[PDB]
């Protein structure tokens, strides 16, 4: 069922995730964006159930895209991914009602857990990032 | 199914919440503690699925009771409740492996989600209390 958007600037990273997702039985389609600006462009014309957004992206960060989604009040869960703690990003994301904020390099099994979790209306934070 | 304990020092809030919880079909029964000590005494006697603990209680606080529950390695899920974001609390609750740390003033609908959430081993934290 899920319509997923994946925003990630590092091309290998982006490909690995979109493919792992595309091959999940629970997934219907997976849009791609190289940076924060493409993600917004796509979200301006297309419908998404979950946006998986990396934080450090060129032009628009994942945090800035999250903030736009909320300002535009879209029916979209937002899963922000990151690798480094290195933040104030947490407060900022939590202040933006991010549906989850989790490690980027986790198992596709773990990512699907997150995806369902936010679909059902709950939230998930990778402790390491707290 | 749920065997619940509620520890709340304000007597009208304790009756309100306990009566509301009892009217829920998912909730089986609710023990009741007027402070942190009554809570522990009750915890070491009866089985309890989830304890809903006020933080600001006389004698022993919610946080103390949480720490005791863990030092006993009880198989109880802990929901801590409060109204004030008080420096140091969220952390201390989270280092003790609290299952939820949420606002007291919420719908029973909301509270029930919290209850289910912690049974399934997940976490919930009210944003207004995170730090
Ligand atoms: Mg990046
Ligand atoms: Mg109190």
């Amino acid at each position: 069922h899920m319509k997923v958007l994946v925003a990630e600037d590092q091309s290998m990273l982006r490909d690995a995730m979109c493919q792992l997702l595309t091959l999940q039985p629970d997934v219907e389609s997976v849009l791609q964006a190289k940076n924060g600006q493409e993600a917004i462009q796509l979200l301006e014309k297309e419908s998404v159930d979950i946006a998986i957004l990396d934080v450090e992206m060129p032009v628009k960060t994942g945090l800035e895209v999250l903030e736009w989604i909320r300002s535009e009040k879209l029916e979209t869960k937002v899963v922000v991914v990151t690798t480094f703690k290195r933040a104030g990003y947490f407060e900022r994301a939590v202040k933006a009602g991010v549906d989850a904020y989790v490690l980027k390099e986790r198992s596709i099994a773990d990512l699907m857990q997150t995806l369902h979790t936010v679909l059902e209306g709950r939230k998930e934070y990778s402790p390491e990032l707290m």
Side-chain angles (χ1 to χ4, degrees), chain A:
Chain A
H1 25 101
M2 312 163 181
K3 291 190 196 62
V4 181
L5 180 161
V6 175
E8 163 61 62
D9 51 301
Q10 303 168 244
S11 59
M12 293 212 75
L13 276 29
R14 189 168 74 252
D15 261 287
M17 176 162 105
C18 292
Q19 299 201 351
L20 281 164
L21 295 164
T22 292
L23 298 208
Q24 297 319 281
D26 294 331
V27 189
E28 179 75 11
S29 57
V30 170
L31 304 151
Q32 304 191 11
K34 286 190 171 66
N35 54 74
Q37 195 60 30
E38 292 190 43
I40 271 145
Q41 305 302 322
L42 304 157
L43 297 167
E44 267 178 4
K45 41 195 187 59
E46 200 131 17
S47 42
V48 182
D49 297 4
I50 315 182
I52 310 185
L53 313 175
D54 165 74
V55 270
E56 285 308 335
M57 290 192 303
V59 193
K60 283 300 193 41
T61 74
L63 292 182
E64 290 173 320
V65 178
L66 160 59
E67 286 153 2
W68 173 90
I69 292 171
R70 295 299 179 240
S71 80
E72 290 286 322
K73 356 212 146 301
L74 308 162
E75 202 87 280
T76 292
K77 305 311 170 174
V78 173
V79 189
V80 162
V81 279
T82 181
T83 175
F84 311 118
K85 204 191 323 298
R86 213 145 302 157
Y89 291 156
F90 196 70
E91 325 174 11
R92 187 189 182 171
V94 170
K95 279 205 177 190
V98 70
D99 298 281
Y101 187 93
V102 299
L103 285 176
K104 179 151 66 166
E105 181 169 330
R106 294 179 315 153
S107 78
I108 188 64
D110 290 329
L111 177 68
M112 296 305 294
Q113 178 42 89
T114 305
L115 265 33
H116 294 290
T117 285
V118 305
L119 252 27
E120 301 161 2
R122 305 179 184 177
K123 291 193 177 55
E124 165 165 15
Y125 314 108
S126 290
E128 315 80 23
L129 298 174
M130 310 197 79

